[PDB]
Amino acid sequence: QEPRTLPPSPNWYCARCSDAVPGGLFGFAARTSVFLVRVGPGAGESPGTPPFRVIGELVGHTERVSGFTFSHHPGQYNLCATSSDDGTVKIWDVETKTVVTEHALHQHTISTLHWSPRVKDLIVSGDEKGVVFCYWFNRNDSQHLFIEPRTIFCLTCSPHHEDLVAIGYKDGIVVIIDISKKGEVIHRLRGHDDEIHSIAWCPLPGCYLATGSKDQTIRIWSCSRGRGVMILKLPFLKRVKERLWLTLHWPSNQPTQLVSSCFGGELLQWDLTQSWRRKYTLFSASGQNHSRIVFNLCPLQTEDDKQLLLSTSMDRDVKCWDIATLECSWTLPSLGGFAYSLAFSSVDIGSLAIGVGDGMIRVWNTLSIKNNYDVKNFWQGVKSKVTALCWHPTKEGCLAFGTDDGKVGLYDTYSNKPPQISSTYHKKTVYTLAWGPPVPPMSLALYSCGGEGIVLQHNPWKLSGEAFDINKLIRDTNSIKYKLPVHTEISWKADGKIMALGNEDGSIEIFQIPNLKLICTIQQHHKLVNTISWHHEHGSQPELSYLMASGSNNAVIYVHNLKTVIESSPESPVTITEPYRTLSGHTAKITSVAWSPHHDGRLVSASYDGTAQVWDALREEPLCNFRGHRGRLLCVAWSPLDPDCIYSGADDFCVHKWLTSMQDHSRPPQ
RNA sequence: AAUUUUU
């Protein structure tokens, strides 16, 4: 009864594209949005489950968000500012999730921005050209500063001095400017030999400064003396050149300690008291750690007075760290491509496979009591966009996948093995996979449909063996010498006695089990058919299994009843020109349709119009419309455990789990 | 694992 959101991956190589504020609110730049996560007691989570929840998304930017900064002024914790490759800096209100005000002052790509800790309405941003804008949103004032012709990597307002800002550059230079003095350089800090990844000011006054660099050192500067006081060299730890991003977190609670990032995304707490010994402590001493570099660290203090630290990483995980134990309280996984596919296993209830465009299958254990985002990654053998997924009907852990390259493979979810790869490769992208009875000349066979329109029948147990093109059986059995339509969808009836094929011309053909005799042809659709779905067998009316839903590049959805024609098994093929039911309201093509396992005659549709709609197919009534995605939907799967609950993925790198009863709208937008 | 990735 709780909606969940699998978000896009936090953006890489940004000095500050994630922040957090007291009372458990965290924000991180993913793709062209910022995602807000409530963490701590106020998340309202059930006990025994990580106390975090995705609650909001900041939609508005046209391009990659490069920077994100919360207001840390008491009473103003709801406002935040972002930066984007679209040249704009936007002030946001998290309560309403809308843009308070924006500016387009930078003339070059923005590097980072920072909300001033001493001026309520002052946000300072800087670009790759070296230009810095001081912006006071209260009365739209603006200051244009140029310090040096060098690329800015990071910038950090002094916490004790309103006029003091620290700027770190790609060449390793670090300078401290005064805003009152037209960004006059007060101090120039030379020592680093490589790009500056983060600047952290001492939380106490009396003016120390910490900098982290690709040159694998952390420097502590004295702003009064203007020179470095202490140099730290990142250690080499167990488990060619290694990528490194070196960010720093200087905890107010422990002024003595410093926590920076290390190779492979290890985290380190440095004890500055033991300067000469140069002691450090490794986070999670006892696979809870990141497997790739960490870009951002965000302190979060919950209302419980528990001190946490959120980390963002190239490994596409957001991790929450408890500062007291140095252990990982929870991890939030993320997607790095479009959610092309969504498949719920019949044998293993709860397990939902996700075909992602980053070339990695995710398996999400929806059933987990202890973990709401319990997701296992399968990258072996994929390496290509996963465009199609289909669980095995009987065998558990057996997962069939298809790729943009036309490759079809068979994964063992339970094993650590690489998947078996079918020797036969589709010429185009694999649109759909389906399990059904074997056909000549070949227990269950695996059927793959290529974007070139060829349906192939592979041997699951001898995937190395040549797959057979089903068109040959269709021609021989039905005595058909005309050129067969190119197939775009393959679907089996629940009994597996009937196979439906959808073709690029929009027609749909129905075949009988033994040797694929053509029983009937349906010509409702006038564009390529993307999706066909048969109704489940367990229902108040027995004849309900004969209902077939159909989705094409037109927005209209058709339902057909095939009990009359299937029962007749006529010697000569029958053509249906009239639909049993007509589902009208989408605005763009239909990518996927799915009948509900819990209710008779209830269909969910996904569409390029960016919405999913649920229908009572029998009364041709639109029940509810889900508008949470910000892109085109590609796939829908009904929850097999909850009747009100649906999963959809879209081209916005998002999977949403939403409740039919929670939607505010009945029908798709006009 | 690979990846300055974001079709």
From Swiss-Prot:
UniProt effect for mutating W245A: Abolishes interaction with U4 snRNA. Abolishes interaction with the 7-methylguanosine cap of RNA molecules. No effect on interaction with SMN complex
Residue stretches of each WD repeat: 60-102, 105-146, 148-187, 240-280, 290-331, 334-374, 381-421, 425-457, 481-521, 524-570, 585-625, 628-668
Modified residues (Phosphothreonine): T49
Chain residue ranges for the region called Important for interaction with U1 snRNA: 1-122
Location relative to the cell: Nucleus, Nucleoplasm; Nucleus, Gem; Cytoplasm
Consequence of changing F338D: Abolishes interaction with U4 snRNA
Subunit structure: Part of the core SMN complex that contains SMN1, GEMIN2/SIP1, DDX20/GEMIN3, GEMIN4, GEMIN5, GEMIN6, GEMIN7, GEMIN8 and STRAP/UNRIP. Part of the SMN-Sm complex that contains SMN1, GEMIN2/SIP1, DDX20/GEMIN3, GEMIN4, GEMIN5, GEMIN6, GEMIN7, GEMIN8, STRAP/UNRIP and the Sm proteins SNRPB, SNRPD1, SNRPD2, SNRPD3, SNRPE, SNRPF and SNRPG. Interacts with GEMIN2; the interaction is direct. Interacts with SMN1, SNRPB, SNRPD1, SNRPD2, SNRPD3 and SNRPE; the interaction is direct. Interacts with cytosolic DDX20/GEMIN3 and GEMIN4. Interacts with SNRNP70 and HNRNPU.
Annotated domain remarks: The WD repeat domain mediates binding to U1 snRNA and to U4 snRNA. The WD repeat domain also mediates binding to the 7-methylguanosine cap that is found both on mRNA and snRNA molecules. The regions that bind snRNA molecules and the isolated 7-methylguanosine cap overlap at least partially. Besides, the WD repeat domain mediates interaction with the 60S large ribosomal subunit.
Task of the protein: The SMN complex catalyzes the assembly of small nuclear ribonucleoproteins (snRNPs), the building blocks of the spliceosome, and thereby plays an important role in the splicing of cellular pre-mRNAs. Most spliceosomal snRNPs contain a common set of Sm proteins SNRPB, SNRPD1, SNRPD2, SNRPD3, SNRPE, SNRPF and SNRPG that assemble in a heptameric protein ring on the Sm site of the small nuclear RNA to form the core snRNP (Sm core).
Disease: Neurodevelopmental disorder with cerebellar atrophy and motor dysfunction: An autosomal recessive disorder characterized by global developmental delay with predominantly motor abnormalities, axial hypotonia with decreased or absent reflexes, gait ataxia and appendicular spasticity. Affected individuals have cognitive impairment and speech delay. Brain imaging shows cerebellar atrophy.
This protein's name: Gem-associated protein 5
Organism, as annotated: Homo sapiens (Human)
Lineage: Eukaryota, Metazoa, Chordata, Craniata, Vertebrata
Name of the coding gene: GEMIN5
